[PDB]
Write a protein that binds this DNA or RNA. Structure first.
Lengths: 97, 113, 229, 48, 229
RNA sequence: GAGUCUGCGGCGCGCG
């Protein structure tokens, strides 16, 4: 929010509405400035987020952050197996690939 | 969507009887003293302030930022003056919509919780 | 044209009456139905200008929470019913029109009971105002204005007469809007958008008319990006 | 072959949240921060 | 004009370089900055067509997973850094331009080392392509095209030279968009919208150019509502 | 006007 202050602009109608619904909630002490409230809310680990599809905010602060996430190994179990027709066992006559 | 909110009662909650209770707690609300959802038996100032004729009328006010969906308001339904929040009214519709027999839709739904 | 331009949004319409009207338009590139549907929705609700009861004055009543003898309904129920009244004026000269009505005795008061006004029309005649018993005296003056969106009775606070009571403003002729974006298949690439927006109107205007007005308010706004400074 | 993360793959964080990718959303409409910086993954709260 | 039309959105611009460009426009009625800002944003990211490395050919290299002697980086790391290259051509006549570069010995290969082409410009000069040791022979041909969105190297599969290797397409000259709607005061009513959207560009195109293209893609789409069916 | 032959038992591990 510091760079935001200097870059030239303050709070949105969006950022203010979520605050109302936020204090009605109990995430920010009622009576403090939006600048001071967003901080309290930010310290809570959640910030304001806009939908992206509508541009409207998401009623209520949503936490966000850097989470370390790994990709699991893709076995030949992932790479699907669908069979029409094919080989058959020599003694039992059941299908096998 | 269907839950109602409750916030602050520091000054009188008795609008049930005085007309000076309607004006005073309506101004006290405009002020900082009485919330839109106060434990005031009959109607917290939140219902006093807004009254919605048609069903739709209720939600338009919501989109415009006048009432949250979880706020306690008054609305006129098919034959009753029902004191039920926007969300609860919205849920009623969704159901009423899924199955066109709207009356048969309120018969089997409870918008009281 | 044949390749990319003929492959143009097929505007399909399905409107019954002047209240409902579905509007389908496809194909659309990636995430465009949403980009078009949401704005048009925000416009259709607030932008389309209209007519709503802005204030009312019962002659013997002082406050909004009173009850009139010989009248079943309470002032609150009546002022409510007035919000339901949909009027239609024909020209700018009519900014604020006050409709007058007075009925007495064992009669039902409908919206067609209002004394006709030259340039104003009432498309909501049978709307029920009240039920008068006996010695039922109801004489009121209900204000009507042209505006946009929703204006709480608290925000404007109209005062033609000192004892009159303001009413919440319901200006748009469109009650509700709705748009869905379901995938559609164009031979080559499956990732496509299909926008269908359903519009509901009180009758004053038609869903199609509303849509047209909406896209215009949007285009007019897109031109406001002309002169830099 | 290059395995570009696709809907079929599964990912999980060191704690224990496991899950598969259900939808590759376009940067165009997913949750975005006040500043244009958009989120990359959206995790369901209920699984916590 | 003087009253309502002169009272028109004052388009003000503030752009430094071809990367950043703020765009302010006020006054706006109720909730319109949002109605205009979000769509344009969704457009600015997806729609705006651009440029990206479509294929590459190292002379002695056959596949994408090889390593060139005298060159620290591996073909994969290099092709990666090429995706980072942002070029800017000036006219439609240049649909596909092949940039050529060859450097030898103890020199660092930067993007300005590409032999200049008449109608094409490189706004990413200092980009690090590779570090050449000694006897470091690197002679490559990197294709460049004009397109839209993201195109996997697998989807197009370009083949100028049989042993060349395609690269993933990154066509948005815009990295990020941002718009704010702060209240503005017009003498009479305080409820007003002011929309200022900040746009950042790789350099290929300019924020202003991008905006113009965006509004156009929106208007062109507003015309697709013409023929009912 | 196409069809043979191989992949079993067990062991280890890992997923739901």
């Amino acid at each position: 929010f510091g760079k935001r202050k200097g870059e030239g602009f303050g709070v949105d109608k969006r950022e203010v509405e979520v605050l109302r619904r936020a204090e009605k909630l109990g995430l920010v002490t009622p009576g403090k400035t939006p600048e001071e409230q967003l901080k309290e809310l930010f310290l809570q680990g959640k910030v304001v987020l806009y939908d992206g599809r509508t541009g409207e905010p998401i009623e209520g602060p949503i936490v966000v952050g850097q989470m370390f996430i790994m990709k699991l190994y893709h076995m030949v179990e992932d790479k699907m197996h669908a069979r029409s027709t094919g080989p058959y066992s020599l003694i039992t006559q059941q299908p096998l690939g | 969507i269907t839950q109602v909110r409750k916030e602050k009662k520091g000054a009188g909650l008795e609008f049930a009887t005085p007309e000076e209770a309607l004006a005073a707690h309506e101004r006290g609300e405009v002020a900082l003293n009485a919330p839109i959802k106060v434990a005031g038996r009959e109607t917290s100032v939140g219902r006093l302030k807004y009254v919605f004729a048609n069903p739709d009328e209720a939600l338009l006010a919501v989109a415009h930022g006048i009432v949250d969906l979880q706020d306690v308001v008054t609305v006129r339904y098919m034959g009753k003056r029902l004191e039920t929040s926007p969300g609860r009214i919205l849920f009623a519709r969704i159901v009423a919509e899924a199955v066109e027999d709207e009356k048969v839709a309120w018969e089997l739904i409870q918008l009281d919780v | 044209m044949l390749d990319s331009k003929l492959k143009a949004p097929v505007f399909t319409v399905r409107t019954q009456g002047r209240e409902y009207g579905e509007f389908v338009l496809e194909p659309l590139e990636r995430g465009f139905g949403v980009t078009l549907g949401n704005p048009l929705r925000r416009i259709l609700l607030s932008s389309i200008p209209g007519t709503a009861v802005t204030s009312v004055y019962i002659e013997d009543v002082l406050h909004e929470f009173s009850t009139i003898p010989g009248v079943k309904e309470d002032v609150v129920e009546i002022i409510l019913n007035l919000k339901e009244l949909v009027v239609r004026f024909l020209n700018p000269s009519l900014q604020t029109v006050t409709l007058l009505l007075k009925a007495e005795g064992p009669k039902e008061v409908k919206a067609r009971d209002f004394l006709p006004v030259a340039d104003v029309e009432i498309m909501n005649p049978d709307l029920h105002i009240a039920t008068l018993e006996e010695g039922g005296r109801l004489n009121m003056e209900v204000r009507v204005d042209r505006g946009v969106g929703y204006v709480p009775a608290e925000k404007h606070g109209i005062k033609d007469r000192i004892n009159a009571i303001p009413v919440d403003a319901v200006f748009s002729p469109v009650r509700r809007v709705a748009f869905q974006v379901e995938d559609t298949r164009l031979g080559q690439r499956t990732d496509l958008d299909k926008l269908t927006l359903r519009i509901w109107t009180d009758g004053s205007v038609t869903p199609l008319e509303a849509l047209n007005q909406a896209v215009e308010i949007l285009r007019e706004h897109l031109t406001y990006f002309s002169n830099p400074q | 072959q290059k395995r570009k993360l696709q809907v079929g793959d599964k990912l999980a964080n060191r704690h224990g949240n496991k899950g598969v990718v259900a939808k590759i959303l376009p940067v165009e409409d997913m949750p975005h921060l006040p500043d244009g910086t958009p989120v990359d993954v959206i995790l369901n709260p209920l699984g916590v």
